[PDB]
Each structure stands twice: as structure tokens, then as C-alpha cells.
Design a protein around this ligand. Structure first.
Ligand SMILES: Cn1c(=O)ccn([C@@H]2O[C@H](COS(=O)(=O)NC(=O)[C@@H](N)Cc3ccc(O)cc3)[C@@H](O)[C@H]2O)c1=O
Ligand SMILES: Cn1c(=O)ccn([C@@H]2O[C@H](COS(=O)(=O)NC(=O)[C@@H](N)Cc3ccc(O)cc3)[C@@H](O)[C@H]2O)c1=O
Ligand SMILES: [Cl-]
Lengths: 411, 413
């Protein structure tokens, strides 16, 4: 039973008419969907939870529909958002749509028969829909009394200063209709999303009954929390140009012991049995398994090997295994970096990188044997870098003591 | 000279935005103004006539009136001060009503008087081809839901779910708001008038004309019809006959008659004041109701309508129904007097029971004998009388009367 299997992973926040959904799933394959709005040029870790859930359903033989909000991205979802967002341009939203669609596609199977994935975009129906048609055909089924009582907008309906525009207030109708539209087009009978999407989902269920006289279901995943009350992902992007695979891998390695088992359940396809066994076997690790699984899932085997290779080289000081592409990950976000003109001495490089406060102090620190250049000790305070120390003619990795790195990027 | 001041003296100004700046704009020269009317029926009623005649009052002062018919807004429904959600009307029915209202409105305005000639407009022209995203982004971004839910016209609808408001009717304010921006761009319309319930829809239009066209526009509302005691009359003669319309004005209370002359006639304020002064110093009952009845009936139904209404009134009081035509009796059958559909060959006594002029046959016998029953103005005291074929006027109409004022028209079949 798929619903019970998801509940055991702690992946079910809320579910409608649950007994009936479980019975529908057990009977045969269904079509389901989750939408993702284009509010940036990439998805982030938070978005990964329902995206992996679409895959969990597909592995059970169901048909996933990944909707990208080409139309909803021009409106703005206010759900549990403290402030009104500035409208984005049509050209920006279109660019983000294509990037998000391309990022989503490798997570699902588009070539596996009847249950092959479908990419959808709500601009296909809203982009040319007449205003009177929308207000009459869709709007008439929506009670403003119920809308103002949706939890997702209550913090926006107390004062105009932290208020809500008619634009963002209409959002709930667009997501609501998307569900009716997908039900009619593909027979989609389930919509999943994070717990903040509950109200947008239930409006879709009700509208589908009113428009198409069809019974559909909703299921939400909990919004991932940290035991120490801090905000999760604080952002970790899926795009390697925004968050390098090394940084991505490191974020998972540094998961708190209190979160690692929940994160294994949420971000991996590891069985609940292996995770429970890992928890018991660790009390007599999990972070290493988590980092490995999620880095491989998002950045591939090559991304994972790069992340591990960079981690080992930094821990050891032996950099010979690093490629120029690995140094590009370090320069992007892996370690602090400083741009310097060739000809700078070791003392100046220590000052400019802020590893040392002055040339006079840097001289003593160098003399004390605290400094490595590409992993090799250098204790001559009057030292100038050799050309061979500018790896690929561009990079020199400085270290002060055991762990304070700064990458020099030669101009 | 000062038009706002003149309308204020008539008691025709409920509210007005920037009374000073609008008075300045009107004094600089002619302006374009508008009022809209939604197709929610196949005719306008007396309530709708007050702003419509104000469009004429502005036109007489040299201004250009635009009469808009809500081809798009009639498909949405105005919730302003309405206790309940209205059912949606079909596109076909709204189009029929749009044509009827446009045609009924047109004779009230001059479409041939130079630069200030009237314009007939329809908001379906811009809403019929507007996409939903364009509306939500370009128009909706300027509207605060916090302000919208607090507007007097809809706040009472947000008290209980079972007596609520749909998103459709909630969006109405944005549509009327955008209409003001369009007419400002298309015709240079700087003023919107309407009844007091339209204040919120008008101010949304003023504000939206600023955000979209960067122009200063004005609003002016006329008061809703209130009676000094605390208590529909259609313009279409097939719904409210010229006779029933005339009678409604005749029966206006003394407390309301002078206000109604100001609201519903083109009589100057000096003439109305002189009439009030005459009725207060004459030493008799007022004659103002007759002046009001004559003015508004001739205005809405023409000289022929007024003359038919006066003719029907005269014949009912006198008794002689000879001057009455088949068309006149059709007005009486419609709404002029209580009416009863009866099978020919019926007894007098039995016609008094069915018409509810009598409780029973035995009781009707005593009333007939007492000489209190008239058939087409003629006395009949024979308790068993049947009815002659000739007194079925035009082979179908017989007018009964018990005493001096209790009438019932028998319509034969
Ligand atoms: C666990 N978790 C997080 O920590 C953060 C987000 N999410 C879910 O990811 C999905 C995509 O997020 S979103 O903000 O882009 N989604 C929306 O704005 C939806 N209104 C997009 C949409 C959905 C359906 C539709 O027909 C049209 C547009 C969300 O499910 C979010 O909850 C997490 O799960
Ligand atoms: C004095 N009085 C009344 O007693 C009753 C009504 N009115 C005004 O008549 C005008 C027409 O009434 S309505 O119900 O057809 N009007 C509406 O529904 C507007 N929302 C139509 C409209 C207006 C502008 C626009 O851009 C689009 C549609 C109203 O002014 C009403 O207040 C009286 O004056
Ligand atoms: Cl050097």
C-alpha cells in the first residue's frame, strides 16, 4: 500500500478521502501531478521533496505530470508568504520556465510505456483565456468567504501595509482550475505538493467536482524542518552554476544527527528498513550515505566523484587529483577566494586574502611554518610564488594552519 | 452658471470628488461624462431614470454624455448593496436586454446637437477580447483585497458563508473601474455619475484612471429614492402601463412631491419653489402631484401616453367608458385595476366572488340589491343578473365596481 509506505517515511502531512485514494491506487495505475512555479532560474532542495515523490509514484506504476507554471509564475503564489512579490516580466518568466522544465525532466521517465511522464505548462490554457470566461466558468464556483478563510492568506488579510493584491488573491483559482484541466486532459486524479499548497489543492478538488463531476484527491508532504528550529536549506540550488556539486555534498555531510534519518526518508529511495537499521547500527555514517545518495541523484556519478575528490584533496592537502573544473568549483563557492595580480609575494597574498592582518604579522606566521602553498609547506617569509605554483596558470591554494583555506585566482 | 451648485439645490448630489476642481473644469468649457446601466432586466425602472435625466441635465449645460450599457458587466453581476448572490444570466438573454436598454435610453439624450452630442457605449467592446492574465496583472495589481473586503457595498456579504459573495461578483468593482479608464482614454471622459450605491465602483475607476492613464477624473453620485414616511415602476409600457405610471405620480405623498419634481422633471428650481409656495399659501390641497404626473408621463410615454393616462383616469371616475379604446382596456387588464379571467356565460353574483369583490354568492345578493354594483359605469341591482353580450366591450372586457373605488376588470375567454 503506497499511501501507508509514504506515511511510514513521514512523507504525508495531509491526505483527502485517504481510504478511497488507497483503494484507487491498489486497483491500477493513476495519473497524478505536482506543479512548480518559475520564481528563479533553478529549483532548490525544498522543491526536490515533491519531485522525488512524483518518481516514487512512477516507480509504483503511476503516471506523473510535472507542471511548470508559465501562467501562475506571471501571477505569484501568496501561500504563507509575508509580503507581496513584484511582478516578473513575460521574457524573464519564459526563460525560467525552460530552465525549470529542463532541470525537472531527468528526474522522471518520459519513455516507459503507458505511465510515461508528461511535462505540462498552465500558460497553454490561461495564456489565451478570456477574462469573462474565467470569471463566469471558474470564478462563480469560488466563495470569497471561504477564500479569506484559507490559512495560506490569513497573515495577509489583517492590514493593507502587509496586504494582498487582487492579482495574488486570484492565484488560488488558477491552481484550482489547473487540477480540473489536467483531470479532463489526462485523467489526473491526484495532486501532490508541500503542506503550504493544501488550500490551492483542495480548491482544485472542489472545482473538479463542480466542473467535471469527477472525484479527485490531494496529498501534501510536510515542509522539511530542522530539530534546532532553524530554517532548512539556509539557499541550496540544484543548478551546479549556483551551488557547486562540492558545496551541495558538503551541506548533506553537515546534516545534524537529529535530522539525518528524516532526511534519508525525504531525499532518498533507500528502503525504510535500511534507514531504520542504519539508525540502530549508528547508535550500536548516515550523513555520508545521505550526501552520497542525494549528490548522485542531483549531479550524477560524475558530480558525486568530483565532490568526494575535492573533499579528500582539501582534507589531505594533496591537490594533484584536482582538475581545472574542480578548481572552478572551489573558486565559485567551495573555499574563500581572492583575485590577485601575478608578482604578488606570499606576505601580500596572506594580507589580501585576509588570512593575515599585516605584512609584519604574515612574516611571523610564515616563519612559524603555518602556511602551505598547494599543500606544500613554505616557511621563507620573503618568498615569491614560482610560475609552476600557479596551477593551470590560474590557481594557487593557500592554507593557514590545518583548515583555513583561500584560493588565489591569478589575474 | 455653477452646475454642481444647481444640482446640489435640487437635492441631486449625494457625494462628489473634489467639488472645487470639478467646478473649475466645468467652468473652463464642455466635458465628457458617463453613466452605466447593466442589463439585468428587459427594461430600466424609475430608480435608473434619476442618473439618466442627470446625463440630460449635464448635456443641457453644454457637456457631452456617454450612456454605457454593460454588455460585459451584465454577464458578471454588480453585488453593490445587494443582500444575495444573483444567478448568472446567459450570453443570449444579456444580448437581448442590452439592445432593449440601449434603445430605451437613446430618446432621453440628444445624439445630434454638435460637439456635445451623446455617445452609446458598451464595455463588451474591451472585455470581450481581454485575456485573463492581462486583467489580473495590468488591472488587478492596483487593487488591495484588504480595501475591497472593507467597502460598504460588499462588507455585509462577508459576514456569513451561506449569505456570501462569489469571486465573480467580487471582481465586478475592477470591471467598472477599468471602464472609467477606457472612456477617459477613448472619449476624454472625466466624470462618472451614478446613484449612491455606485460610489465604490466609481472611486475604483477614479483611482485606476490615475494608475493606467495618469489623468485626474471625477465622481458624482445622486441620492437613492427615499420617502419621508420610511417606505417596480418600469419605463416599458408593456411592463408598467402609461396609466399605472401616471397614477403612481398622482399618489405621491406631500412630503415627497417637491423632491420628486426636482429629481424627475426639467422644471427650473424657481418654478418648483413657486409651486411649493403656492400649495403652502393657496388654502387648499396641493396641485404639485398633478404637475409631477403630467411632466414625467409626457417625458417617458410622450403626449399620446399622457393623453391615454388622463383619458383612462377620467373614464374610471366619471363611469362613461365610451371614450376607452381596446388599447386602453389592455392597459387596465395589464396592471390598471385588479383583474379576473372568467368563462363567458357567468352570473353577476358569481363574478363578484371570483373577483374577490364579495366573499360568497349569498353575500353578493345583498350588495347587488343595495345598489352598490356597477357594470361599465351602469347601476345593476337585480341580484340574479347574468350579463349581456354587448357589455363584453370589444367582446372581452367588463368593468365591475363595488362602491366608489373598488374595481375589478373581468377578462372574458
Ligand atoms: C518540502 N518543500 C519545501 O521545503 C519547499 C517547497 N516545497 C514544494 O515544492 C513545490 C514547488 O514549490 S513552488 O513554490 O514553486 N510551488 C508553487 O508556487 C505552487 N503554487 C506551484 C503550482 C502548483 C500547481 C499548479 O497547478 C500550478 C502551480 C510546492 O508543492 C511546494 O509546496 C516542498 O515540498
Ligand atoms: C436613484 N437610483 C435608484 O433608486 C436606483 C438606481 N440608481 C442608479 O441607476 C444606475 C443604473 O443601475 S444599475 O443597477 O443598472 N447599475 C449598475 O449595476 C452599475 N454597476 C452599471 C455600470 C456602471 C458603470 C460601468 O462602467 C459599468 C456598469 C446606477 O448608477 C444606480 O446607482 C439610482 O440612481
Ligand atoms: Cl611570483
Amino acid at each position: 500500500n503506497l499511501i501507508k509506505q509514504l506515511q511510514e517515511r513521514g512523507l504525508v502531512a495531509q491526505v483527502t478521502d485517504e481510504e478511497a485514494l488507497a483503494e484507487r491506487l491498489a486497483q491500477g495505475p493513476i495519473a497524478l501531478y505536482c506543479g512548480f512555479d518559475p520564481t528563479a532560474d533553478s529549483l532548490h532542495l525544498g522543491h526536490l521533496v515533491p519531485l522525488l515523490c512524483l518518481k516514487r509514484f512512477q516507480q509504483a506504476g503511476h503516471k506523473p505530470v510535472a507542471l511548470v507554471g508559465g501562467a501562475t509564475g506571471l501571477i505569484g503564489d501568496p501561500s504563507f508568504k509575508a509580503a507581496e512579490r513584484k511582478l516578473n516580466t513575460e521574457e524573464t518568466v519564459q526563460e525560467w520556465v525552460d530552465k525549470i522544465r529542463k532541470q525537472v525532466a531527468p528526474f522522471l521517465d518520459f519513455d516507459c510505456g503507458e505511465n510515461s511522464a508528461i511535462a505540462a505548462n498552465n500558460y497553454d490554457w490561461f495564456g489565451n483565456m478570456n477574462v469573462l470566461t474565467f470569471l463566469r466558468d471558474i470564478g462563480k464556483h469560488f466563495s470569497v468567504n471561504q477564500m479569506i478563510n484559507k490559512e495560506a492568506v490569513k497573515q495577509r488579510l489583517n492590514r493593507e501595509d502587509q496586504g494582498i493584491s487582487f492579482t495574488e488573491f486570484s492565484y488560488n483559482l488558477l491552481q484550482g482550475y489547473d487540477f480540473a484541466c489536467l483531470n479532463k486532459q489526462y485523467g489526473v486524479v491526484l495532486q501532490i505538493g508541500g503542506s503550504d499548497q493544501w488550500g490551492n489543492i483542495t480548491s482544485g478538488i472542489d472545482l473538479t467536482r463542480r466542473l467535471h463531476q469527477n472525484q479527485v484527491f490531494g496529498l501534501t508532504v510536510p515542509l522539511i524542518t530542522k530539530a534546532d528550529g532553524t530554517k532548512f536549506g539556509k539557499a541550496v540550488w540544484l543548478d551546479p552554476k549556483k551551488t557547486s556539486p562540492y558545496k551541495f555534498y558538503q551541506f548533506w555531510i553537515n546534516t545534524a544527527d537529529a535530522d539525518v534519518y528524516r532526511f534519508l526518508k525525504f531525499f532518498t529511495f533507500m528502503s525504510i528498513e535500511e534507514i531504520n537499521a542504519l539508525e540502530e547500527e549508528d547508535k550500536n555514517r548516515a550523513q555520508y550515505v545521505l550526501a552520497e545518495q542525494v549528490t548522485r541523484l542531483v549531479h550524477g556519478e560524475e558530480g558525486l566523484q568530483a565532490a568526494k575528490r575535492i573533499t579528500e584533496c582539501l582534507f589531505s592537502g594533496s591537490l594533484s587529483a584536482l582538475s581545472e573544473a574542480d578548481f572552478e568549483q572551489l573558486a565559485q563557492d567551495g573555499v574563500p577566494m581572492v583575485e590577485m595580480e601575478k608578482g604578488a609575494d606570499l606576505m601580500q597574498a596572506l594580507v589580501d586574502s585576509e588570512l593575515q592582518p599585516s605584512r609584519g604579522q604574515a612574516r611571523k606566521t610564515i616563519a612559524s611554518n603555518a602556511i602551505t602553498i598547494n599543500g606544500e609547506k613554505q616557511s621563507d617569509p620573503e618568498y615569491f610564488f614560482k610560475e609552476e605554483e600557479r596551477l593551470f596558470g590560474r590557481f594557487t591554494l593557500l592554507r593557514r594552519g590545518k583548515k583555513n583555506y583561500c584560493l588565489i585566482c591569478w589575474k
